[PDB]
Write a protein that binds this DNA or RNA. Structure first.
Length: 627
DNA sequence: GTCAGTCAGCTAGTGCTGAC
DNA sequence: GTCAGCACTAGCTGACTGAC
């Protein structure tokens, strides 16, 4: 229809009219700092949107490109960047539209499908790469990933999702989408009724482009309000850290971690054979060939039929992991426990990994999220890295890329050091000034032995108790904590003596406990001023939030510094799980990489913590499970 | 020849029970 | 706290009797 193809030359298909091609004379400065009059083509909705946000937009395709459009970018301080894509996955999908929003101008839409003169994107490249231009993005991780994968470089960034998430102080989990944020702050409904319209088509209809335009112009108003809201809340440090840490997360997701297919196959074969053998052994032991082991009720019934009892001559009524410890005086239960371990390991890692492995590159790629965790630490999904077993044999599957070598660095006692810093415990700080671990010190006070005489087992008990009592556990739960996660049986009187001895000397932590318990505050702040406001008081989380948040801040600062300091030797930041950072570097630059990693981690530690001095243990690893 | 009354397999949901 | 895996209990949906 002649109505519908009015603007086909610029790849626009009319749906319900509501589109006009209008030209007006603009006033722009020249490269010689001289105002120049230029005529531009911009489209407009025939029906004015009820809100005050802009809806004008240029479209820049192969034909319509005008060289003078690059002058908008000059002498700016913020610009709104949003990109539309055919699908979610970065590897299987391209970028359809790039949008730029410069204040008091329409939104410039670059149609990458109808762009072939590579000088077109030069202005986009320079506005993206400039470090003096605060690019505003919504959900910066997704857009940054798509841009980096296609040879673009984007340097500065300001994500409205991070600002909104931090400002809410973890009040609500859901929300924090573009429509919700704009409604909450600027009092406007974006009418996001586009139900994921088909983007693959070369031709794009009016509603899609206009909805994409209001998603870019609305970011500048959010920038203005969120900047002031953050400034009034003293959240600028953590916001800056998160914004600059967006890009390292994109690097980690893009590069991934390679899996040795041959070793994975060998381990899977061996583990399946071991599972079959143990299953057969249990089958003979349970004396029921038809028995299915996985049925929890059925194994309970079978063990009941076996009539094995307790030390109290009590029949088993539960196969809880700790209840198995109470019933260990038989070969049956040993076989059952071994089978449970093998089954969980097998069907949780070995049979699940092949789905995640991309046969195109034979690498595992993760989806890192940086503010879903309450404490602030990174959380992985799709493949859950923290759920990967941490035993030696399982991790060896992960190898570096061909012709490379891993560097692995991990903090030591970052929680305990941060606790010492915040609580200002004099004895801990005077201890760490002379390089003695707080596990060794805790063991020394517990066992009354001299420092050189401390063994490894005392260090283990210290490892238990320091974590136990530095997050405000009542001494009753110390027994459960030590037994369950470390296996050390303990008596209540021993727990009482340990509690008294621990809080008699480390005075600072006692003062911290007293203050936090007395105030019963509903709001807490970390050393990066990451504020959280709970619904109701909880002593455990009240004690746990500051140290964990500060540890997350230290890791994020380390990644931000590392991503800038590793660009010379072209090292990839691969993963960051727990207090551990992994970088892959070419085999020549091993020494330089080690120095860079250590320096970045130490500087990050020294930025927030001042009294103490963190240390990092770095080992060059052939495989992630190296020595 | 035909329709009730009762016998079920199937699918869901909840109950309950375990570890990464 | 998240997660799968299974009895058990229930309600439904066709087929095997039961009939005057």
């Amino acid at each position: 229809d002649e109505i519908t193809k009015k603007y086909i030359k610029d790849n626009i298909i009319n749906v319900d009219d509501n589109i006009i091609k209008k030209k007006d004379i603009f006033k722009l400065k020249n490269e010689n700092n001289e105002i120049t009059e230029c005529a531009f083509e911009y489209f407009e909705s025939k029906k004015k949107f009820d809100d005050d946000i802009e809806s004008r937009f240029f479209i820049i395709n192969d034909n319509n490109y005008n060289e003078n459009i690059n002058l908008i970018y000059k002498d700016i301080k913020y610009c709104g960047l949003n990109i539309q894509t055919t699908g979610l996955e970065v590897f299987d999908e391209n970028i359809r539209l790039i949008q730029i929003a410069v204040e008091n101008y329409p939104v410039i839409i670059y149609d990458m499908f109808n762009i072939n003169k590579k000088d077109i994107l030069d202005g986009l490249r320079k506005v993206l790469e400039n470090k003096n231009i605060i690019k505003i993005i919504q959900n910066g991780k997704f857009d940054a990933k798509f841009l980096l994968h296609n040879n673009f470089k984007i340097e500065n960034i300001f994500d409205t999702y991070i600002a909104s998430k931090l400002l809410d102080k973890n009040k609500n989990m859901y929300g924090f989408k573009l429509n919700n944020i704009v409604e909450k702050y600027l009092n406007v409904i974006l009418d996001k009724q586009q139900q994921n319209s088909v983007w693959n088509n070369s031709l794009l209809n009016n509603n899609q482009l206009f909805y994409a335009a209001r998603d870019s112009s609305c970011l500048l108003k959010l920038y203005k309000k969120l900047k002031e809201e953050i400034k009034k809340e003293n959240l600028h440090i953590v916001n800056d850290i998160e914004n600059k840490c967006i890009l390292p997360i994109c690097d980690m997701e893009l590069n991934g971690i390679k899996v040795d297919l041959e070793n994975l196959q060998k381990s899977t074969n061996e583990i399946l054979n071991e599972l079959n053998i143990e299953k057969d052994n249990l089958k003979k032991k349970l004396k029921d060939e038809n028995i299915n082991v996985n049925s929890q009720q059925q194994v309970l019934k079978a063990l009941q039929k076996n009539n094995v009892r307790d030390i109290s001559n009590k029949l088993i009524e539960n196969t809880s992991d700790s209840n198995l410890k109470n019933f260990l005086n038989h070969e049956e239960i040993i076989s059952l426990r071994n089978y449970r371990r093998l089954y969980k390991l097998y069907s949780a890692f070995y049979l699940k990994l092949p789905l995640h492995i991309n046969t195109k590159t034979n690498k595992i790629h993760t989806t890192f999220n940086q503010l879903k965790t309450f404490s602030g630490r990174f959380s992985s999904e799709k493949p859950n890295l923290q759920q990967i077993p941490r035993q030696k044999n399982i991790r060896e599957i992960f190898i570096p890329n061909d012709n490379n070598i891993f560097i692995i660095a991990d903090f030591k006692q970052i929680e305990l050091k941060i606790a010492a810093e915040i609580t200002n415990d004099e004895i801990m700080l005077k201890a760490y000034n002379n390089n003695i671990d707080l596990h060794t010190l805790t063991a020394s006070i517990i066992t009354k032995k001299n420092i050189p005489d401390i063994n490894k087992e005392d260090r283990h008990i210290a490892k238990a108790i320091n974590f136990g009592l530095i997050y405000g556990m009542n001494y009753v739960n110390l027994k459960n904590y030590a037994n369950t996660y470390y296996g050390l049986n303990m008596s209540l009187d021993q727990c009482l003596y340990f509690y008294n001895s621990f809080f008699e000397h480390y005075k600072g932590i006692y003062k911290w406990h007293n203050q936090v318990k007395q105030k019963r505050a509903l709001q807490y702040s970390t050393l990066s001023n990451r504020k959280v406001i709970f619904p109701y008081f909880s002593f455990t989380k009240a004690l746990n939030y500051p140290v964990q948040g500060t540890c997350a801040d230290i890791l994020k600062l380390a990644l931000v510094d590392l991503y800038d300091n590793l660009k010379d030797i072209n090292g990839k930041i691969i993963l960051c799980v727990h207090d551990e950072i992994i970088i892959e570097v070419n085999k020549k630059f091993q020494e330089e990489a080690l120095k860079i990693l250590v320096q970045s981690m130490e500087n990050s530690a020294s930025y927030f913590l001042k009294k103490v001095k963190c240390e990092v243990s770095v080992k060059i690893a052939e495989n992630w499970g190296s020595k």
